[PDB]
Amino acid sequence: NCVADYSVLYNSASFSTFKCYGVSPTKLNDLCFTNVYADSFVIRGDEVR
Amino acid sequence: VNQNAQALNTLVKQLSSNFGAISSVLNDILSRLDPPEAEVQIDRLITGRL
Amino acid sequence: YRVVVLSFELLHAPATVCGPKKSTNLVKNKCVNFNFNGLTGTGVLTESN
Amino acid sequence: QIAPGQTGKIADYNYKLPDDFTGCVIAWNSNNLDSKNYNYLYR
């Protein structure tokens, strides 16, 4: 039920990776979704791959 | 006349096929992906449609 | 490492999470480029029966 | 960001390659020579 400005996220240098697979990240401002789910957890840095 | 119809109908049902691309619709690929990756997928469509 | 995974439902249903873009007024009965909900194309728009 | 067709702060605003770049990107650590330092400007 909202507007998601993905440019705010993608422009952040805090991210060590910002890897978009089934979409290209510039298109996130052009697209629309019927659901979005954020997953959220901690791992060791060698396990990000 | 039935064979000239089955030919055009089956030619158009092959627009619904993916050929293993991420979508059957060219505009979906061109909405979802930037050109460096979209061209990898559209070449699936041009290979399968041709 | 703090991991966020933004899973997207690209599946066909009503628009629910959207990109940071202004809509514009709909034109009927004339040739127009269009986008609805990221469904991009070109066409003539008319009242359906 | 120093590759063909990339996006990011350099790949938009400072240095961008064509999607079909022919050439080679050669890079090395220079902390031993360039660090002191704030004369290295970017957008």
Curated annotation (Swiss-Prot), chain A:
Q: Describe the subunit structure.
A: Binds to host ACE2. RBD also interacts with the N-linked glycan on 'Asn-90' of ACE2. Cleavage of S generates a polybasic C-terminal sequence on S1 that binds to host Neuropilin-1 (NRP1) and Neuropilin-2 (NRP2) receptors. Interacts with host integrin alpha-5/beta-1 (ITGA5:ITGB1) and with ACE2 in complex with integrin alpha-5/beta-1 (ITGA5:ITGB1). May interact via cytoplasmic c-terminus with M protein. May interact (via N-terminus) with host bilirubin and biliverdin, thereby preventing antibody binding to the SARS-CoV-2 spike NTD via an allosteric mechanism.
What name appears for this protein in its UniProt entry? Spike protein S1
Q: Result of mutating residue 49 to S? A: In strain: Omicron/BA.2, Omicron/BA.2.12.1, Omicron/BA.2.75, Omicron/BA.4, Omicron/BA.5, Omicron/BQ.1.1, Omicron/XBB.1.5, Omicron/EG.5.1
Effect in UniProt of substituting residue 9 to I: In strain: Omicron/XBB.1.5, Omicron/EG.5.1
Q: Which domain of life is it from?
A: Viruses
Q: Which organism is it from?
A: Severe acute respiratory syndrome coronavirus 2
Task: Give a short account of what the protein does.
Answer: Attaches the virion to the cell membrane by interacting with host receptor, initiating the infection. The major receptor is host ACE2. When S2/S2' has been cleaved, binding to the receptor triggers direct fusion at the cell membrane. When S2/S2' has not been cleaved, binding to the receptor results in internalization of the virus by endocytosis using host TFRC and GRM2 and leading to fusion of the virion membrane with the host endosomal membrane. Alternatively, may use NRP1/NRP2 and integrin as entry receptors.
Q: Where is this region: Integrin-binding motif?
A: 44-46
UniProtKB/Swiss-Prot annotation, chain C:
* Renumbered residue ranges of the record's region Disordered: 12-34
Q: Which domain of life is it from?
A: Viruses
Assembly: Binds to host ACE2. RBD also interacts with the N-linked glycan on 'Asn-90' of ACE2. Cleavage of S generates a polybasic C-terminal sequence on S1 that binds to host Neuropilin-1 (NRP1) and Neuropilin-2 (NRP2) receptors. Interacts with host integrin alpha-5/beta-1 (ITGA5:ITGB1) and with ACE2 in complex with integrin alpha-5/beta-1 (ITGA5:ITGB1). May interact via cytoplasmic c-terminus with M protein. May interact (via N-terminus) with host bilirubin and biliverdin, thereby preventing antibody binding to the SARS-CoV-2 spike NTD via an allosteric mechanism.
**Task of the protein:** Attaches the virion to the cell membrane by interacting with host receptor, initiating the infection. The major receptor is host ACE2. When S2/S2' has been cleaved, binding to the receptor triggers direct fusion at the cell membrane. When S2/S2' has not been cleaved, binding to the receptor results in internalization of the virus by endocytosis using host TFRC and GRM2 and leading to fusion of the virion membrane with the host endosomal membrane. Alternatively, may use NRP1/NRP2 and integrin as entry receptors.
Question: What is the protein name for this chain?
Answer: Spike protein S1
Q: Which organism is it from?
A: Severe acute respiratory syndrome coronavirus 2
